[PDB]
Amino acid sequence: LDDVSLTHLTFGKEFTEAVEAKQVAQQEAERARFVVEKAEQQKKAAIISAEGDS
Amino acid sequence: LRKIRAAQNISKTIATSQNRIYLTADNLVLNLQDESFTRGSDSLIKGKK
């Protein structure tokens, strides 16, 4: 055997449902990521500003 | 100076207050009309010979 690969783990209805579900979860999770990052950035900016004023 | 910076920001928020009321529209009145007549001021009686 040259190669063995699993192709289309399904059913077909399942293709879409599964991908869709994961997609939504991913979007929300990543947005949460943005939130965390943004919070860190703001914290950082605050530190630097204080230093700068200093 | 971090204190100064913070003080500046806080002062900005506290001090600054403004109110604005704005309403505008383009008034472009275009009228096409004529002073026509639909009345009987007085009836003069005339005749042709």
Q: Does B4 touch chain A if contact means CB atoms closer than 8 Å? A: yes
Residue of A nearest to B5 (CA): A53
How does B6-39 read in b/e, with b if 16+ C-beta sit within 10 Å?
eeeeeeeeeeeeeeeeeeeeeeeeeeeeeeeeee
For residue B8, the chain A residues in CB contact (below 8 A) are 53
The resolution in Å comes to: 16.3
Q: Answer positive or negative: Cα dihedral of B10, B15, B16, B17.
A: positive
* Residue owning tokens 């869709």: A20
Q: How was this structure determined?
A: cryo-EM
Q: Angle, to 10 degrees, between the axis of helix A12-53 and the axis of helix B2-15?
A: 110
Q: Answer positive or negative: Cα dihedral of A10, A13, A16, A21.
A: negative
Peptide bond connecting A11 to the previous residue in cis, omega within 30 degrees of 0: yes
For residue A51, the chain B residues in CB contact (below 8 A) are 2
